[PDB]
Subunit: 90 residues, 4 copies
């Protein structure tokens, strides 16, 4: 559990297909992909690295394909920025 | 009234107090500051426009712990920024 | 541009399809529907105004599973309602 | 853990002081209070029952007092409506 509020919910398009690997413990699945979402003005769109661990990692690899529009819920992490996903709506 | 969902709400600590000026139109206030939040700690640039720019300037100070609501933005190498909608101290 | 933070984002299933009409001003579209989400399951009235009212009417149908972003409202005994800002199907 | 997204973050005022009790297991603290927040128009303000379990329950009772303005993060639950709090910013 985390002590601080860090709720980031984004509607985005999958632009780099999810790749899966097992973490150091050779037991926890970890999936990473890249998504793109609109700038606040038309601002170039933004691209963000998205990472999921465990069950959500398997769901990302299983469901997310290039050009799919999804909603992601996760915590912002940061120098490289990334969204550590908790849930995804396909 | 933006097209896409982009809701980022974070609890963070001000590590670089707000600085305000007026933008291009030479009428709209714009405030920028930097906050830090738990992961080492992450540092994030925060920007507010209009009425909220004035609120940030009026209330946020170094070391203040606040809640920020805004939209995530990545501008161009790449620099992440939270464009603030509302702030709670 | 509301004063207070009120951000409610829920994944839910449409259990009563949207119905649309025009409001008082006799110009602004307003759509109402009912969704259900996991706790027995909870049922929640959902209302949208203007452009999003039309989006709800155009895209949401019985049994659809969607994501809704809006502000929580309790009107008067008491009835809870989510006033929609955005919807994703 | 919950399968569905249910992220409700509200800025509100404490209007009924937190009351603490121990759940059925006579071990898990549970605190409940009531908060009030603005209607969407000036709509009468809304009042909502707020409930916290475990560590957050102790934090609510310890910190939240009448007229305190707080930010609550939790999941909406519903016939009586209530916000099951995960985190609070005092």
């Amino acid at each position: 559990h985390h002590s601080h509020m860090n709720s980031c919910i984004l509607q985005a398009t999958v632009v780099e297909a999810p790749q899966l690997r097992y973490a150091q413990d050779n037991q926890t699945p970890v999936a990473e992909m890249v998504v793109q979402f609109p700038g606040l003005s038309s601002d170039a769109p933004a691209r963000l690295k998205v990472v999921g661990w465990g069950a959500v990692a398997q769901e990302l690899q299983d469901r997310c394909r290039l050009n799919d529009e999804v909603v992601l819920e996760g915590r912002l992490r940061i120098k490289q920025t990334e969204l550590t996903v908790t849930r995804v709506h396909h």
